[PDB]
Write a protein that binds this ligand. Structure first.
Ligand code: HEM
Ligand code: HEM
Ligand code: HEM
Ligand code: HEM
Lengths: 141, 141, 141, 141
């Protein structure tokens, strides 16, 4: 579970994510596409896969805004992500394994951009991303 | 992934014993039902996912032929599958799906052999499908 | 989630597991040790790792009995597995990744021993094992 | 796992730039905190997991030397690590832990290089640590 200390760490981070949604989102996606090329298959409409690319920037902002919003619903995460869980598990059909891969890339995006990123903060973020991945995988079968 | 000599002999013997197209069709039905998201690129099936359904039978014929080519020369599988791997990326297949099919194939082998599918045999089969998944994922860029 | 149809499938299976706890448990563990040798490191006291081995049989029975009991607490799974979750996450420190590996082996044990194991039943069991793995990983950090 | 020529050159350059023992010690502290179960075989640390703690500094010296041996000949890493791999199984290390250390190492590289740790660099580092994890897991039987 997320302790009271973890929740405060996550809420503070949500504020920074919201402020830098487009740039951090584009960076995280660019990393996902480079380390795990099979993830590019879900974005066949794209004209490019660099962080510099406009389509990458737009999707990145949406993803980060959704992640920032979730940091304000830590007590009711299941109900809050229900709609996104339905979209991914019933319409998009993104293999659930990709949620964990993306989490590991997001952590690196944070490390590159944050002034400080100590192990304690890293732990709180990883636990949060793990819950989000679990909830987004809840409506596949 | 590397198969030992006795493991190569085990897989060659299995291919001589089982009905190629039929066991592959059963493995496909099982992957479509147990892991629903694998049906993403199969809308042409029209919801007909049974082993005996025409569409599944047709795809099983394609997959079993490729498996035979792998088994005929287990030491050069990656080299022999480079073009097939690139083709899968073009089609848009998620490489994780390859691992899921390996799991359903092992269940079908278990149902066929029952008690003779002991831990050693199971390990040999597991390694073979890991080699195949790896070969199919190698030409993704 | 587990539907009403899934729950009945799981409850019926729990009865069969209870009746064959030692044999099925020993088989599942033997498969885990063979396919994934690193799992043997948690059982350094063992004099052998075959299904035939007495220590393997004893641990197998315990694991299967705990799994059978869980099938009767489908509505309250989190609270029911809390004690085991604590033991694994605070004292044993078994890498959580191993829970999924074990699940895939258990499915094969069932396929080898059950008279019939259709894709629908397989799906219900896999969903159950996925929840159990999630709950057993809840107290690691 | 295979590194391309430019990837080999990237990793060689990084090893010339970073403080070997210190960045490894930081990566160790991060793995012990973010993934607590990795401390299983480290009871001798007495709860002292900081990068500057004597016990962590001593283990970091061992790990960095081995990493150097891998980097000196990236094409024969598996051959060169056979004995070290067998030794890890004897010690009782779970092979999954190797992948977790790779993840914390990449976060430390991100903190060191910041903006210059672009997607291409990140991919090169990811592949290197995958090669290392694979080499260390190869002699497990
Ligand atoms: C932190 C995890 C993730 C979050 C919070 C997230 C969030 C979202 C959101 C907010 C949307 C748009 C929903 C709408 O406007 O209706 C979406 C769409 C989508 N997501 Fe996810 N997603 C996540 C991970 C992934 C991953 C890992 C992939 C694929 C590898 C993925 C692929 C897609 C695709 C293909 C779309 C559709 C985009 C479009 O309509 O153009 N998502 N996701
Ligand atoms: C691991 C075993 C697999 C082998 C050996 C294999 C083999 C093949 C072959 C030989 C083709 C024909 C390529 C061509 O048209 O030139 C093909 C097509 C395709 N494969 Fe795979 N495949 C495997 C697994 C999968 C899996 C698990 C999926 C995804 C769920 C998949 C999805 C497809 C699709 C969508 C096509 C195109 C079908 C069509 O055009 O009608 N394959 N595969
Ligand atoms: C379906 C998943 C699992 C279940 C239901 C389960 C259940 C249990 C139970 C009931 C015990 C004994 C508790 C007691 O009597 O205090 C236990 C002990 C243990 N489990 Fe798990 N376990 C699972 C998976 C695993 C896995 C995958 C591993 C390791 C690879 C593992 C390693 C251990 C160890 C080392 C012990 C201690 C045995 C002893 O005291 O001699 N377990 N587990
Ligand atoms: C991936 C990088 C790694 C490398 C290159 C590496 C290297 C080494 C080396 C060179 C030794 C000394 C072997 C000897 O005494 O002859 C060692 C020991 C050991 N390693 Fe690893 N190792 C790695 C990761 C890990 C991880 C992630 C763990 C587990 C969390 C681990 C746990 C241990 C333990 C417990 C010992 C014995 C320590 C002692 O005797 O004081 N290693 N490792």
């Amino acid at each position: 579970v997320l302790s009271s200390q973890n929740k405060k760490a996550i809420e503070e981070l949500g504020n920074l994510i919201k402020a830098n949604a487009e740039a951090w989102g584009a960076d995280a996606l660019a990393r996902l596409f480079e380390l795990h090329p099979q993830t590019k298959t879900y974005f066949s409409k794209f004209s490019g896969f660099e962080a510099c690319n406009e389509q990458v920037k737009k999707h990145g902002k949406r993803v980060m805004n959704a992640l920032a919003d979730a940091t304000h619903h830590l007590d009711n995460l299941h109900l809050h992500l229900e709609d996104l869980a339905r979209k991914h598990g019933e319409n998009l059909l993104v293999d659930p394994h990709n949620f964990h891969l993306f989490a590991d890339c997001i952590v690196v995006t944070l490390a590159v951009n944050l002034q400080a990123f100590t192990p304690v903060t890293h732990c709180a973020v990883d636990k949060f991303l793990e819950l989000v991945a679990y909830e987004l995988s809840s409506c596949y079968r | 992934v590397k198969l030992s000599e006795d493991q190569e002999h085990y897989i060659k013997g299995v291919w001589k014993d089982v009905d190629h197209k039929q066991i592959t069709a059963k493995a496909l039905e099982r992957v479509f039902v147990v892991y629903p998201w694998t049906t993403r690129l199969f809308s042409k099936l029209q919801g007909l996912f049974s082993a005996n359904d025409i569409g599944v039978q047709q795809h099983a014929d394609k997959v079993q032929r490729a498996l035979g080519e792998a088994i005929d020369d287990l030491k050069k599988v990656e080299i022999n599958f480079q073009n097939l791997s690139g083709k899968h990326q073009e089609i848009g297949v998620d490489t994780q799906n390859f691992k899921l099919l390996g799991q359903t194939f092992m269940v079908e082998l278990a149902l066929h052999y029952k008690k003779t599918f002991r831990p050693k045999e199971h390990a040999a089969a597991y390694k073979f499908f890991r080699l195949v998944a790896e070969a199919l994922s190698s030409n993704y860029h």
